[PDB]
Amino acid sequence: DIQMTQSPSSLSASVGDKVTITCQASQSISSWLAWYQQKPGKAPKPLIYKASSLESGVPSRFSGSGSGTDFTLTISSLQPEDFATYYCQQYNSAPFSFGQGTEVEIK
Amino acid sequence: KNCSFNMTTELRDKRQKVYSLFYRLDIVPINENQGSEYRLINCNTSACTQA
Amino acid sequence: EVQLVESGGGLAKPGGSLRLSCAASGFTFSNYWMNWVRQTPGKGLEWISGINSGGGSRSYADSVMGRFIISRDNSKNTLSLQMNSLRAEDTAVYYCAKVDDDDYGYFDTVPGDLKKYYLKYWGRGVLVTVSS
Ligand SMILES: *[C@@H]1O[C@H](CO)[C@@H](O[C@@H]2O[C@H](CO)[C@@H](O[C@@H]3O[C@H](CO[C@H]4O[C@H](CO[C@H]5O[C@H](CO)[C@@H](O)[C@H](O)[C@@H]5O)[C@@H](O)[C@H](O[C@H]5O[C@H](CO)[C@@H](O)[C@H](O)[C@@H]5O)[C@@H]4O)[C@@H](O)[C@H](O[C@H]4O[C@H](CO)[C@@H](O)[C@H](O)[C@@H]4O[C@H]4O[C@H](CO)[C@@H](O)[C@H](O)[C@@H]4O)[C@@H]3O)[C@H](O)[C@H]2NC(C)=O)[C@H](O)[C@H]1NC(C)=O
Ligand SMILES: *[C@@H]1O[C@H](CO)[C@@H](O[C@@H]2O[C@H](CO)[C@@H](O)[C@H](O)[C@H]2NC(C)=O)[C@H](O)[C@H]1NC(C)=O
Incomplete structure (x- = not known):
């Protein structure tokens, strides 16, 4: 069935540096794709519900875009409290496949 | 009463x-046992x- | 605010049976779909089951089709997932999640179908493992 592809697998960062996680899709999904992050020992939380729409409560800093198979996330690491996995999950399909996850941390 | 029901289109x-909201005087129970299932x-x- | 928690998980044996439970509060449980997902150690997440607001049209993944049975009780405002013939590979922190938008609106046959959803609120997952 439909499966997602997320990259980069892992990368280093700092405070202020802009990192962008992007994930590909085997089949066209238009714009039905949400992004998530999960701290160690905490349950996953939503940040972006649509391919280019922000989630209520999250700071206006976060962003990201894409359509069809391609999609990307926009980060500026203006904070030290965003260092944890960033999952890419698609919907509008029976399995609702998740991404392999990407870890980001300070050098 | 804040009632919910299925409808056509x-x-x-x-x-x-x-x-939609409905006045209690305009609603009557169906079986008088479940509390819901108003008519x-x-x-x-x-x-x-x-x- | 919305409060969601699940319990019932724990140590079980391969090929046996187990039952998971998930309680909801702070919102109309009878107007929101519920999905079950697992977080195995190391690799990413994975969706395994889903149920509608009415408790029917239960959906499952190919990896748990015929083994895991989902169920909910709108009267008690709780959700459950029966486990049958579980194996060692089925170890994970099963998370209880709720959809974003309610089932109100147009639909084909199931009240909440025809509308796209995403896991917005997540409960405090419970770990389940089995070993000899
Ligand atoms: C708009 O339209 C849509 C579509 O028409 C409407 O959706 C539907 O709305 C109705 C009415 O609300 C819902 O009915 C209710 O469904 C629940 C759930 O039913 C599912 O689970 C049943 C339980 O399964 C057992 O077995 C499995 C393993 O097989 C176990 O895992 C479980 O744990 C259970 O042990 C299952 O029986 C149902 O399927 C079977 O039965 C149906 C007929 O009932 C058959 O068609 C199927 O083929 C199959 O044989 C189904 O899978 C039911 O639980 C509800 O009944 C309970 O509640 C009633 C009200 O109190 C009560 O009269 C019943 O006796 C029964 O009682 C139990 O629950 C009560 C409440 O908790 C307890 O108090 C009581 O003690 C007891 O425990 C009821 O049938 C539909 O599910 C829903 N969706 C669909 C897809 O139809 C929508 O409502 C409409 N909207 C509006 C606003 O009008
Ligand atoms: C239609 O429904 C109404 C409301 O249930 C019925 O009238 C009531 O019937 C009950 C039966 O116990 C009486 O106690 C009430 O006094 C009746 N009236 C009211 C105002 O509630 C009615 O009989 C039903 N059928 C017809 C043909 O009208």
């Missing part, structure tokens, strides 16, 4: 779920015409 092959009072005698 222009597309005969599709339905929709809606909700419009006039439903078992005639179909009212919307003004």
